[PDB]
Amino acid sequence: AECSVDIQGNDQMQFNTNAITVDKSCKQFCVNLSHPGNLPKNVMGHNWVLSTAADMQGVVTDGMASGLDKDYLKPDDSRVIAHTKLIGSGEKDSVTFDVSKLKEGEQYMFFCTFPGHSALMKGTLTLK
Ligand SMILES: [Cu+2]
């Protein structure tokens, strides 16, 4: 339970946490994304996407250009460490990834890549 976290993305374009700490001793880490609200995926879709801070903007811009059918992520984007699928209200999806893909001292960002959402739907992730 300290190798996993529940996060919500709602109808008002926000996650319910903007900082995540991953414990170094965790071999794997799991994020459970749910979407309270009423809006459908094609209007207020949310995913949970992880990259380094420096790669976030690039991931977001290319993802936006990839369209709804591609869950607003460039296929095989080498900058994406982990991601859930894009979900609408009433849905949930998790992602489990190797913690060895992170390193101490580097700033990671988690974010949604649905068009415009990362303005508010982002947060730091850190390994400790
Ligand atoms: Cu979103």
HSE, CB side, 13 Å, CA atoms: give it for residue 105: 0
In the reported structure, the alpha carbon of residue 9 is separated from the centroid of ligand 1 by a whole-number distance in angstroms of 7
The protein residues having their C-beta less than 5 angstroms from ligand 1 (an ion) are: 46, 112, 114, 117
Neighbours of 12 (CB within 10 A): 9
| Resolution of the structure in the document, Å | 1.9
Domains of the chain (ranges; CATH) run 1-128 (2.60.40.420)
| 23-48 residues labelled b (16+ CB within 10 A) or e (exposed) | eeeeeebebbbbbebebebeebbbbb
Please report, for residues 52, 102, 108, 127, the alpha-carbon distance to residue 105 in angstroms, rounded to integers and kept in the order given.
11, 9, 10, 8
In the reported structure, the alpha carbon of residue 93 is separated from the centroid of ligand 1 by a whole-number distance in angstroms of 13
**What technique determined this structure?**
X-ray
Q: What is the 3-state secondary structure (H, E, C) of 33-102?
A: EECCCCCCHHHHCECCEEEEHHHHHHHHHHHHCCCHHHCCCCCCCCCCCEECCCECCCCEEEEEEEHHHC
Closest CA to 14 of 86, 92, 112, 87: 112
In the reported structure, the alpha carbon of residue 106 is separated from the centroid of ligand 1 by a whole-number distance in angstroms of 24
| The length of the chain, given as a count of residues | 128
Binding site for Cu cation, by residue number, is 46, 112, 117, 121
The C-alpha atoms of residue 53 and residue 77 are separated, in whole angstroms, by: 15
Cα 76 to its chain centre, rounded Å, is 16
Residue type, 14: Q
Q: Can you name the residues that pair with 49 across neighbouring β-strands? A: 83, 111
Cβ atoms of 108 and 125 within 8 Å: the answer is: yes
Cα 90 to its chain centre, rounded Å, is 17
